[PDB]
Structures are given as C-alpha cells and as structure tokens.
Amino acid sequence: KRNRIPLRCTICRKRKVKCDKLRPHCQQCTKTGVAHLCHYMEQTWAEEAEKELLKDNELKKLRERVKSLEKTLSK
Amino acid sequence: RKRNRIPLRCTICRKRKVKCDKLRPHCQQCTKTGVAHLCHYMEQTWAEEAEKELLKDNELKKLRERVKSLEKTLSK
DNA sequence: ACGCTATTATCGCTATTAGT
DNA sequence: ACTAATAGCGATAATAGCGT
Ligand SMILES: [Zn+2]
Ligand SMILES: [Zn+2]
Ligand SMILES: [Zn+2]
Ligand SMILES: [Zn+2]
Ligand SMILES: [Zn+2]
Numbered sequence: 703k704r705n706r707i708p709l710r711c712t713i714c715r716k717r718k719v720k721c722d723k724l725r726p727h728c729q730q731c732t733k734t735g736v737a738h739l740c741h742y743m744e745q746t747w748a749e750e751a752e753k754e755l756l757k758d759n760e761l762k763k764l765r766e767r768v769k770s771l772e773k774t775l776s777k
Numbered sequence: 778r779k780r781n782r783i784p785l786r787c788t789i790c791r792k793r794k795v796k797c798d799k800l801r802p803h804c805q806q807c808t809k810t811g812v813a814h815l816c817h818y819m820e821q822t823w824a825e826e827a828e829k830e831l832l833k834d835n836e837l838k839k840l841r842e843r844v845k846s847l848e849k850t851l852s853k
Numbered sequence: 854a855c856g857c858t859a860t861t862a863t864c865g866c867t868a869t870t871a872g873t
Numbered sequence: 874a875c876t877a878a879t880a881g882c883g884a885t886a887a888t889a890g891c892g893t
Contacts (some may be wrong), residue, residue: 703886704862704863704864704885705863705864705886706861706862706863706884706886706887706888707888708888708889709810709811709861709862709888709889710888710889710890714887716854716890717854717855718854718855718856718887718889718890718891719854719889719890719891720890720891721890723810723811724811725814734821737887742811745812747789747792747793747863748789748792748812748815750788750792751788751789751792751812751815751817752815754830755814755815757830757833757834757837758785760837760839760841761840762837764837764840764841764844765840767844768840768843768844768847769821771847771848772847774851775847775850775851777826778872778873778877778878779871779872779873779878780872780877780878780879781871782870782871782878782879784879784880786880786881790881791879791880793862793863793882794863794864794880794881794882795862795863795880795882796880796881810861810862812870818890
C-alpha cells in the first residue's frame, strides 16, 4: 500500500501512451492539438518545491506590477 | 539535534530518499522523472533557508496588500 | 484507444556520520 | 557511548508504454 502519483501528464496517461514529461506541456499533447489542457499531478515530495515556485513567481510579478500601478497613479 | 550539514543531493532527491548524481544545473534523477524545474541544491543551512523564506513570505503578504490597495484607489 | 506486460518509484528498514 | 540526523537500498506496488 504505497502512494505513487503518475509522472505522466494526466491527458496522455489516459491515452495509455508515452509521455515526454516536457513542461509546461508535453510534446505529445502539443501534437494532438491540446497543449494547454496538459498538466501534471502534484507529487507529495515536490511540495515545498512547488510552493516556493509559486511564491517566487508572484513576488516577481507583484513587484513589476506595483511599479506600473504607481506610474498610472500619476493621474 | 543541531544540523550543520549542507546536503549534496538535490532537495527533491532527499525528499524522495534516492541517489543524486549531483549534476548541475539539475540532477538527472529529477530530469528523468520530469521535475527538473524543481531541482535545487542547498547553498545554506536549513535554519538559514527557513529564516530567508520567512522574510520572503512577509514581503509577499505586504506587497500583495500594497498592490491591492493601489488597485482599489484606481476606481477613477 | 486499450488489454496486457515491462519498467519504475515508494518507504520500511539497514547502515553511516556526527551532536552532545 | 548513545542516538538524532542523514543517506539510500531494494522488494514489490503500481504506473508506463507497446502495438493495433
Ligand atoms: Zn503527456
Ligand atoms: Zn498552457
Ligand atoms: Zn500532456
Ligand atoms: Zn537529485
Ligand atoms: Zn534533482
């Protein structure tokens, strides 16, 4: 009774095919016209990793945004 | 109880309890399982990375709240 | 696009380093 | 010495991928 989460994107895991786990979307989906419906299930061991990947990306965006917002604010 | 050792196996490998070929920028274990954008090697102690992340956290909360406030102001 | 087999990854458990 | 902290193997559970 182990906990294994698919490493293939959920689309072409359903297709029971070979997933080139490319990110954000595997070539296999990109080719069958569904690039952006391609996503990978969350692993328990990539928790911290994934949460910091989000924190990182947000501080970055939030930073460049405060700038633009406050130049706008110049009425 | 004190931890002064900075691991040589990427963090994902530690988490996954496996062997890291310790290559850069990302170990091959991660590349094979497809989670390379998540591979990272500790450059600091756990307690140092923890504090560092805590402060990053606070900046996030204030920046988001500052962005929101500046967003509301913009009604007209 | 799917039954079936091949190949892989989870986690208890064994083993090694080092704090006190 | 005693044991937490750390590293990692390996049997086996469970997913990966083939060919159609
Ligand atoms: Zn795929
Ligand atoms: Zn997309
Ligand atoms: Zn896909
Ligand atoms: Zn690794
Ligand atoms: Zn790695």
